Amino acid sequence: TRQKQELEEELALAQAYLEPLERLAALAHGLDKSPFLRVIPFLLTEKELPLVEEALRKALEDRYLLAHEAYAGGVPALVVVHRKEVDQAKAALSRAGVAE
Amino acid sequence: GLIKSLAEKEKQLLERLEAAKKEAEERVKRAEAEAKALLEEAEAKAKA
């Protein structure tokens, strides 16, 4: 029964979150294990996408990279920012109400 | 904006660091060797 519970919880999460993580991984392929670049994953709905972009753009100038790729419904979005620009990047998501 | 910009720029940032560390060690290396050979000339000369 213990195996069975672990097997069932794993399925339940994996069934939910495989498609976003696939999308997100793909967007910054081979750049998630680099120290030079920082990646932050987050989910946005069609509604939220414009607000988030504005907020990041003012906060982070034009030296930030906002990319998104669909999955059937909203977009999992990835913002890629320089290392040591992490706090600022985060602060920008937090003001819109979007989190990591 | 393509991911290719930062991707293929990162893999150059790593080469620039590597040459830095190389020619740091390959310089000090020379000096340590040159310090030995100098003090051998100072023994060779001094006893003769």
PDB file of C-alpha atoms in Angstrom:
ATOM      1  CA  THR A   1       0.000   0.000   0.000  1.00  0.00           C
ATOM      2  CA  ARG A   2       2.916   2.400   0.633  1.00  0.00           C
ATOM      3  CA  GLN A   3       4.397   1.761  -2.753  1.00  0.00           C
ATOM      4  CA  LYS A   4       0.977   2.275  -4.226  1.00  0.00           C
ATOM      5  CA  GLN A   5       0.474   5.653  -2.536  1.00  0.00           C
ATOM      6  CA  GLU A   6       3.913   6.919  -3.737  1.00  0.00           C
ATOM      7  CA  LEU A   7       3.209   5.620  -7.279  1.00  0.00           C
ATOM      8  CA  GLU A   8      -0.244   7.341  -7.291  1.00  0.00           C
ATOM      9  CA  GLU A   9       1.078  10.798  -5.961  1.00  0.00           C
ATOM     10  CA  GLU A  10       3.916  10.803  -8.432  1.00  0.00           C
ATOM     11  CA  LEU A  11       1.416  10.153 -11.320  1.00  0.00           C
ATOM     12  CA  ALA A  12      -0.892  12.845 -10.156  1.00  0.00           C
ATOM     13  CA  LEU A  13       1.904  15.551 -10.172  1.00  0.00           C
ATOM     14  CA  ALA A  14       3.551  14.142 -13.374  1.00  0.00           C
ATOM     15  CA  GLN A  15       0.214  14.025 -15.261  1.00  0.00           C
ATOM     16  CA  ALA A  16      -0.218  17.766 -14.243  1.00  0.00           C
ATOM     17  CA  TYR A  17       3.234  19.281 -14.768  1.00  0.00           C
ATOM     18  CA  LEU A  18       4.995  17.293 -17.570  1.00  0.00           C
ATOM     19  CA  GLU A  19       3.773  19.611 -20.392  1.00  0.00           C
ATOM     20  CA  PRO A  20       4.794  22.860 -18.799  1.00  0.00           C
ATOM     21  CA  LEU A  21       8.279  21.656 -17.729  1.00  0.00           C
ATOM     22  CA  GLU A  22       8.819  20.257 -21.348  1.00  0.00           C
ATOM     23  CA  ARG A  23       7.933  23.652 -22.817  1.00  0.00           C
ATOM     24  CA  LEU A  24      10.005  25.607 -20.337  1.00  0.00           C
ATOM     25  CA  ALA A  25      13.018  23.271 -20.632  1.00  0.00           C
ATOM     26  CA  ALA A  26      12.932  23.526 -24.417  1.00  0.00           C
ATOM     27  CA  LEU A  27      12.900  27.377 -24.452  1.00  0.00           C
ATOM     28  CA  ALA A  28      16.229  27.755 -22.647  1.00  0.00           C
ATOM     29  CA  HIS A  29      17.760  24.421 -23.731  1.00  0.00           C
ATOM     30  CA  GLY A  30      21.251  24.031 -22.266  1.00  0.00           C
ATOM     31  CA  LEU A  31      21.285  27.272 -20.387  1.00  0.00           C
ATOM     32  CA  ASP A  32      19.698  26.200 -17.072  1.00  0.00           C
ATOM     33  CA  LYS A  33      22.899  24.648 -15.884  1.00  0.00           C
ATOM     34  CA  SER A  34      25.017  27.717 -16.795  1.00  0.00           C
ATOM     35  CA  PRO A  35      26.179  30.211 -14.009  1.00  0.00           C
ATOM     36  CA  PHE A  36      26.437  33.011 -16.478  1.00  0.00           C
ATOM     37  CA  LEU A  37      22.640  33.075 -17.114  1.00  0.00           C
ATOM     38  CA  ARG A  38      19.851  32.723 -14.475  1.00  0.00           C
ATOM     39  CA  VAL A  39      16.465  31.249 -15.433  1.00  0.00           C
ATOM     40  CA  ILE A  40      13.243  31.596 -13.527  1.00  0.00           C
ATOM     41  CA  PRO A  41      10.141  29.506 -14.582  1.00  0.00           C
ATOM     42  CA  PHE A  42       6.574  30.730 -13.988  1.00  0.00           C
ATOM     43  CA  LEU A  43       3.076  30.251 -15.251  1.00  0.00           C
ATOM     44  CA  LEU A  44       1.028  33.049 -16.836  1.00  0.00           C
ATOM     45  CA  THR A  45      -2.467  33.018 -18.316  1.00  0.00           C
ATOM     46  CA  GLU A  46      -3.276  34.995 -21.476  1.00  0.00           C
ATOM     47  CA  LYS A  47      -4.634  37.737 -19.228  1.00  0.00           C
ATOM     48  CA  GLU A  48      -1.524  38.067 -17.122  1.00  0.00           C
ATOM     49  CA  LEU A  49       1.033  38.005 -20.003  1.00  0.00           C
ATOM     50  CA  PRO A  50       0.941  41.650 -20.996  1.00  0.00           C
ATOM     51  CA  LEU A  51       1.195  42.913 -17.342  1.00  0.00           C
ATOM     52  CA  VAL A  52       4.153  40.753 -16.507  1.00  0.00           C
ATOM     53  CA  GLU A  53       6.128  41.839 -19.624  1.00  0.00           C
ATOM     54  CA  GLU A  54       5.518  45.542 -18.849  1.00  0.00           C
ATOM     55  CA  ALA A  55       6.627  45.070 -15.242  1.00  0.00           C
ATOM     56  CA  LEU A  56       9.727  43.192 -16.172  1.00  0.00           C
ATOM     57  CA  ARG A  57      10.597  45.607 -18.947  1.00  0.00           C
ATOM     58  CA  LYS A  58      10.557  48.696 -16.771  1.00  0.00           C
ATOM     59  CA  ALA A  59      12.326  46.888 -13.946  1.00  0.00           C
ATOM     60  CA  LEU A  60      14.940  45.115 -16.056  1.00  0.00           C
ATOM     61  CA  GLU A  61      15.441  47.530 -19.094  1.00  0.00           C
ATOM     62  CA  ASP A  62      16.080  45.830 -22.453  1.00  0.00           C
ATOM     63  CA  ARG A  63      18.734  43.222 -21.520  1.00  0.00           C
ATOM     64  CA  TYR A  64      16.187  40.754 -20.109  1.00  0.00           C
ATOM     65  CA  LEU A  65      14.750  37.944 -22.307  1.00  0.00           C
ATOM     66  CA  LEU A  66      11.034  36.996 -21.984  1.00  0.00           C
ATOM     67  CA  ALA A  67      10.093  33.957 -23.865  1.00  0.00           C
ATOM     68  CA  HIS A  68       6.987  31.787 -23.899  1.00  0.00           C
ATOM     69  CA  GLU A  69       5.768  28.713 -25.635  1.00  0.00           C
ATOM     70  CA  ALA A  70       2.176  27.275 -25.481  1.00  0.00           C
ATOM     71  CA  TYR A  71       0.813  24.068 -24.336  1.00  0.00           C
ATOM     72  CA  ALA A  72      -2.988  24.416 -24.932  1.00  0.00           C
ATOM     73  CA  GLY A  73      -4.537  27.077 -22.749  1.00  0.00           C
ATOM     74  CA  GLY A  74      -2.084  29.485 -20.995  1.00  0.00           C
ATOM     75  CA  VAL A  75       1.677  29.875 -21.597  1.00  0.00           C
ATOM     76  CA  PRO A  76       4.479  28.693 -19.307  1.00  0.00           C
ATOM     77  CA  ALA A  77       6.877  31.650 -19.546  1.00  0.00           C
ATOM     78  CA  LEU A  78      10.384  31.901 -18.780  1.00  0.00           C
ATOM     79  CA  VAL A  79      12.271  35.064 -18.018  1.00  0.00           C
ATOM     80  CA  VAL A  80      16.048  34.737 -18.398  1.00  0.00           C
ATOM     81  CA  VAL A  81      18.160  37.358 -16.631  1.00  0.00           C
ATOM     82  CA  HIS A  82      21.757  37.947 -15.764  1.00  0.00           C
ATOM     83  CA  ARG A  83      23.326  36.625 -12.586  1.00  0.00           C
ATOM     84  CA  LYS A  84      23.125  39.229  -9.856  1.00  0.00           C
ATOM     85  CA  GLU A  85      20.052  40.760 -11.499  1.00  0.00           C
ATOM     86  CA  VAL A  86      18.083  37.947  -9.713  1.00  0.00           C
ATOM     87  CA  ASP A  87      16.577  40.108  -6.902  1.00  0.00           C
ATOM     88  CA  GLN A  88      15.339  42.736  -9.238  1.00  0.00           C
ATOM     89  CA  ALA A  89      13.883  40.117 -11.559  1.00  0.00           C
ATOM     90  CA  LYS A  90      11.970  38.518  -8.662  1.00  0.00           C
ATOM     91  CA  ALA A  91      10.710  41.840  -7.280  1.00  0.00           C
ATOM     92  CA  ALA A  92       9.189  42.502 -10.677  1.00  0.00           C
ATOM     93  CA  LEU A  93       7.203  39.229 -10.589  1.00  0.00           C
ATOM     94  CA  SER A  94       6.182  39.762  -7.025  1.00  0.00           C
ATOM     95  CA  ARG A  95       4.645  43.257  -7.776  1.00  0.00           C
ATOM     96  CA  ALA A  96       2.374  41.785 -10.484  1.00  0.00           C
ATOM     97  CA  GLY A  97       1.342  38.972  -8.015  1.00  0.00           C
ATOM     98  CA  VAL A  98       3.057  36.189 -10.183  1.00  0.00           C
ATOM     99  CA  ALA A  99       5.505  33.907  -8.362  1.00  0.00           C
ATOM    100  CA  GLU A 100       8.057  31.168  -9.245  1.00  0.00           C
TER     101      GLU A 100
ATOM    102  CA  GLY B   1      15.524  37.695 -29.841  1.00  0.00           C
ATOM    103  CA  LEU B   2      16.395  33.998 -30.211  1.00  0.00           C
ATOM    104  CA  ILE B   3      17.838  31.826 -27.416  1.00  0.00           C
ATOM    105  CA  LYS B   4      20.808  31.425 -29.745  1.00  0.00           C
ATOM    106  CA  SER B   5      22.242  34.826 -28.800  1.00  0.00           C
ATOM    107  CA  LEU B   6      22.966  34.208 -25.143  1.00  0.00           C
ATOM    108  CA  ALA B   7      23.466  30.373 -25.722  1.00  0.00           C
ATOM    109  CA  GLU B   8      26.297  30.670 -28.198  1.00  0.00           C
ATOM    110  CA  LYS B   9      27.635  33.689 -26.297  1.00  0.00           C
ATOM    111  CA  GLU B  10      27.843  31.792 -22.979  1.00  0.00           C
ATOM    112  CA  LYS B  11      29.998  29.032 -24.666  1.00  0.00           C
ATOM    113  CA  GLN B  12      32.473  31.834 -25.570  1.00  0.00           C
ATOM    114  CA  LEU B  13      32.436  33.393 -22.110  1.00  0.00           C
ATOM    115  CA  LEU B  14      33.722  30.034 -20.875  1.00  0.00           C
ATOM    116  CA  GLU B  15      36.633  30.042 -23.432  1.00  0.00           C
ATOM    117  CA  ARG B  16      37.659  33.548 -22.338  1.00  0.00           C
ATOM    118  CA  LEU B  17      37.884  32.351 -18.757  1.00  0.00           C
ATOM    119  CA  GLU B  18      39.772  29.299 -19.603  1.00  0.00           C
ATOM    120  CA  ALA B  19      42.580  31.233 -21.434  1.00  0.00           C
ATOM    121  CA  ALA B  20      42.674  33.559 -18.526  1.00  0.00           C
ATOM    122  CA  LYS B  21      43.418  30.827 -16.017  1.00  0.00           C
ATOM    123  CA  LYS B  22      45.854  29.120 -18.482  1.00  0.00           C
ATOM    124  CA  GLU B  23      48.145  32.098 -19.211  1.00  0.00           C
ATOM    125  CA  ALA B  24      47.975  33.060 -15.484  1.00  0.00           C
ATOM    126  CA  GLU B  25      49.521  29.734 -14.442  1.00  0.00           C
ATOM    127  CA  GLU B  26      51.818  29.578 -17.693  1.00  0.00           C
ATOM    128  CA  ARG B  27      53.230  32.972 -16.575  1.00  0.00           C
ATOM    129  CA  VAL B  28      53.930  32.300 -13.003  1.00  0.00           C
ATOM    130  CA  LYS B  29      55.312  29.008 -14.116  1.00  0.00           C
ATOM    131  CA  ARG B  30      58.022  30.817 -16.143  1.00  0.00           C
ATOM    132  CA  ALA B  31      59.026  32.977 -13.182  1.00  0.00           C
ATOM    133  CA  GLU B  32      59.401  30.083 -10.743  1.00  0.00           C
ATOM    134  CA  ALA B  33      61.502  28.226 -13.216  1.00  0.00           C
ATOM    135  CA  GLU B  34      63.583  31.319 -14.024  1.00  0.00           C
ATOM    136  CA  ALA B  35      64.073  31.839 -10.160  1.00  0.00           C
ATOM    137  CA  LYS B  36      65.524  28.319  -9.782  1.00  0.00           C
ATOM    138  CA  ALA B  37      67.932  28.625 -12.843  1.00  0.00           C
ATOM    139  CA  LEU B  38      69.120  32.062 -11.641  1.00  0.00           C
ATOM    140  CA  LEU B  39      70.026  30.853  -8.154  1.00  0.00           C
ATOM    141  CA  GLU B  40      71.943  27.850  -9.849  1.00  0.00           C
ATOM    142  CA  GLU B  41      73.979  30.373 -11.750  1.00  0.00           C
ATOM    143  CA  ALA B  42      74.597  32.097  -8.380  1.00  0.00           C
ATOM    144  CA  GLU B  43      75.939  28.740  -6.954  1.00  0.00           C
ATOM    145  CA  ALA B  44      77.906  27.759 -10.026  1.00  0.00           C
ATOM    146  CA  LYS B  45      79.515  31.171 -10.106  1.00  0.00           C
ATOM    147  CA  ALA B  46      79.989  31.494  -6.314  1.00  0.00           C
ATOM    148  CA  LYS B  47      81.934  28.247  -5.704  1.00  0.00           C
ATOM    149  CA  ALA B  48      84.110  28.718  -8.833  1.00  0.00           C
TER     150      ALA B  48
END
